[PDB]
Design a protein around this ligand. Structure first.
Ligand code: HEM
Ligand code: HEM
Ligand SMILES: C[C@H](O)[C@H](O)[C@H]1CNc2nc(N)[nH]c(=O)c2N1
Ligand SMILES: C[C@H](O)[C@H](O)[C@H]1CNc2nc(N)[nH]c(=O)c2N1
Ligand SMILES: O=[N+]([O-])c1cccc2c(Br)n[nH]c12
Ligand SMILES: O=[N+]([O-])c1cccc2c(Br)n[nH]c12
Ligand SMILES: [Zn+2]
Lengths: 410, 407
């Protein structure tokens, strides 16, 4: 089989063979497409085959397929699984898997960087405090004074699912949200539920607008614990506008390190419930989503009022106009403070390049158009005119239930 | 089974039961999503007809009745005899209105029922088609107060007597390749602009030249016609704050009329069914004017605004885009021609969805196409989860006539 993909702006066509290896479901039938849907304890019998294909790929990548190191490893694993039920990965395998989980992330436009990832082996960690130390080093190394570096910390893999390691925060660094009795919201509405759990666990919230949330870390299945990330480790950028001198008076600022922490990393059947991972922001995620989604800091009205725009009738595009300035500002502020960041034009052009290379490299590049195209100026970026095939490959990063909806408290 | 759809901006969850009645395939599989891919007999005809007639009667509260059953037999026998059949007027109107209703890629379906249907089934010639099309263009333009419309020429018979409108739209600008290697006018039509030339049309080699209609009837060779200029409502694009805009010398037409699609109703295929409504601002502002392969005016527009085009991070393309789309919506309103912006259009669609889910059990929607090509996440339709599936009656793509005609 072969599947064709065309770019309606360069007439450039590509052939995908990689999709043949995709096993998992996508949520789509031959009769229904759920492409725009958000979210459409493994037995011994299930584990080995998964371990096998993984180790087969690993070895193939290092050009040692069928070798002696290859077979002995398969025999070693098969045996270990039979007696211990599970199995531990070698460092080189963990490193290989992590990079590939990233490489297979169909919703990630910054994948050109997949190969350059710093993997921290946190499998010897045993307590929440231990996790705090590990996280702190991840944040420090990754931030690098503004010159960001990719990185991921991998904590202990799941055993019986009763002893999971989990990072309760969705991102290692994030602002608190507090619902006021008057119905309004202070801070980031997206984090209100979590902000609550934190206060209910002992966090003394400053009750401000940009309060860096505390980490709630869960080790070996025990109750989660609170910790405050060293302020001197949390790099932040105050947002001002290049020409709008009233912008600085909006009181806005954002953190520099985006590090998702609620996903699950699957490598060769093994599940890693806690695997925080960071890279570096694309302007629009802060500029259009965090600042402008109606359900976030929703700053359009106030940025428009001060821009003195005709907010009488939407056909004036006061919202579109304000959005560009706001994004102008997020990018300008980061550049001025020498903190890594990429704009949607650069990131998307690079992605097309990475994408093409990946077709002539491994016969495909699973991509989710809905998530790849930016939340603004979509059609003036190259990814918009790009056809994409979306399929699941392992290793992978998956969503998982929020830890508070399942955890059995002691 | 039973699928639910959530809006992540309002948390509203709707339940879809309509997809169960899905016929054609989507191109996807459990193994691969093709969401972003632009395009993935007597025994055959009667079942298709029955399904349609069934829906029709169910819609008029006469499901099963004698009328229902009678007509069902009438058609059955007709197909048995004439190897095909003809739709009563009421079924045609319903069929067309419902093909629109089922257009998963159209954001303006909230207007689905308010569609004027012109029955051009008795047409026999290209001149006849011009007369029909002309009346269609004048009725829908209505001096700027646009009205939705569709004209349906004779349905297919043996496939060698196909009625077709070679233009992709009843009204579009010509595109010409210049000595240089560049392109004058609209690149999207360069080819067709050539076929019109190879056929006789005297191309004025201008930036915005209104192409001629190339009409085909009963499988014959296509003929050329010039839509009465008095019937082609155009708008010069000026900016509400940049008096230098006019100097860009831009103008677009007011009537969006897709004409290269094929309408299927109850098994029957109407290969010539031009339909029109009114423009959503972004279609012209961002796609027609800014798309790299179209007019690609961004570089010049930026200049004139005197902004740093040295680094992409200045968002000068973004900057220009907004102003260019301001100018489009601005001009249309000032000349009192109907037009809708991406903000109102999408808000309207959401409501339409809320109605369709309770009044029909769902609404087939293609996210990739519904989300406007600018300010996507600030329009409500961005956070709206969608379910795409194909339903008939429907509008489908079909091969360009020049790539399949026997002259
Ligand atoms: C180098 C900087 C990087 C950039 C600029 C980049 C950019 C992005 C963006 C814009 C998204 C969509 C964000 C959203 O709307 O929520 C995304 C998604 C994602 N990225 Fe990256 N990324 C980078 C690094 C990483 C790293 C290091 C990994 C993993 C090791 C990764 C894995 C993913 C995953 C799994 C998602 C989807 C998350 C979800 O399903 O919600 N990205 N990335
Ligand atoms: C009344 C105003 C209407 C508005 C504002 C509207 C708007 C839209 C938009 C924005 C698209 C995507 C355009 C593109 O990117 O090419 C579209 C596509 C479409 N619309 Fe509408 N529409 C309207 C009326 C109609 C009518 C009257 C019909 C049919 C009776 C219709 C049938 C369709 C179809 C089939 C498509 C998809 C065609 C394709 O795949 O290229 N629309 N519409
Ligand atoms: C409903 C729809 O799936 C949802 O709004 C998606 C669309 N595309 C997205 N794309 C990115 N990058 N991030 C998001 O959160 C979303 N949300
Ligand atoms: C490749 C991709 O399918 C293609 O660029 C689509 C995306 N969404 C679109 N949406 C609309 N409304 N119109 C288009 O022409 C497209 N092009
Ligand atoms: O840049 N982003 O917009 C963005 C969003 C979500 C996750 C990440 C990571 Br990990 N790096 N950058 C990201
Ligand atoms: O508004 N649009 O962008 C648009 C595009 C393509 C076709 C139509 C029709 Br018919 N009405 N509006 C349309
Ligand atoms: Zn799909």
């Amino acid at each position: 089989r072969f599947l064709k993909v065309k770019n309606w702006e360069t007439d450039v066509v590509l052939t995908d063979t990689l999709h043949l290896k995709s096993t998992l479901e996508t949520g789509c039938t031959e009769h229904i497409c759920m492409g725009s849907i958000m979210l459409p304890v493994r037995t011994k019998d299930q584990l080995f085959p998964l371990a096998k294909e993984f180790l087969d790929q690993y070895y193939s990548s290092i050009k040692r397929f069928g070798s002696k190191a290859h077979m002995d490893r398969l025999e070693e694993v098969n045996k270990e699984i039979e007696s211990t039920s599970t199995y531990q990965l070698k460092d080189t395998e963990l490193i290989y898997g992590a990079k590939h989980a990233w490489r297979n992330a169909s919703r990630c436009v910054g994948r050109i960087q997949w190969s350059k990832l710093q993997v921290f082996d946190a499998r010897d960690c045993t307590t929440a405090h231990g996790m705090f130390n590990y996280i702190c080093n991840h944040v420090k190394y990754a931030t690098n004074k503004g010159n960001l570096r990719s990185a991921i910390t991998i904590f202990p893999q799941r055993t019986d699912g009763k002893h999971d390691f989990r990072v309760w925060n969705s991102q290692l660094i994030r602002y608190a949200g507090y619902k006021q009795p008057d119905g309004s919201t202070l801070g980031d509405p997206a984090n209100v539920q979590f902000t609550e759990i934190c206060i209910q666990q002992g966090w003394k919230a400053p009750r401000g607008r940009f309060d860096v949330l505390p980490l709630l870390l869960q080790a070996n299945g025990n109750d989660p614990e609170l910790f405050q990330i060293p302020p001197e480790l949390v790099l932040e950028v105050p947002i001002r506008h290049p020409k709008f001198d009233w912008f600085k008076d909006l009181g806005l600022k954002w953190y520099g390190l985006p590090a998702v922490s609620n996903m699950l990393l699957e490598i060769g059947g093994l599940e890693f419930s806690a695997c925080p991972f960071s890279g570096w922001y694309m302007g629009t995620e802060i500029g259009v989503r965090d600042y402008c989604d109606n359900s976030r800091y929703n700053i359009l009205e106030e940025v428009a009022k001060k821009m003195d725009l005709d907010m009488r009738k939407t056909s004036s595009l006061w919202k579109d106009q304000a959005l560009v300035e706001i994004n102008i500002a997020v990018l300008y502020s980061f550049q001025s403070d020498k903190v890594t960041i990429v704009d949607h034009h650069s990131a998307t052009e690079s992605f097309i390049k990475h994408m093409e290379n990946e077709y002539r490299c491994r016969g495909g590049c699973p991509a989710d158009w809905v998530w790849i195209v930016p939340p603004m100026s979509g059609s003036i970026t190259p990814v918009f005119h790009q056809e994409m095939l979306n399929y699941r490959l392992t290793p992978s990063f998956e969503y998982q239930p929020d830890p508070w909806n399942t955890h059995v408290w002691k």
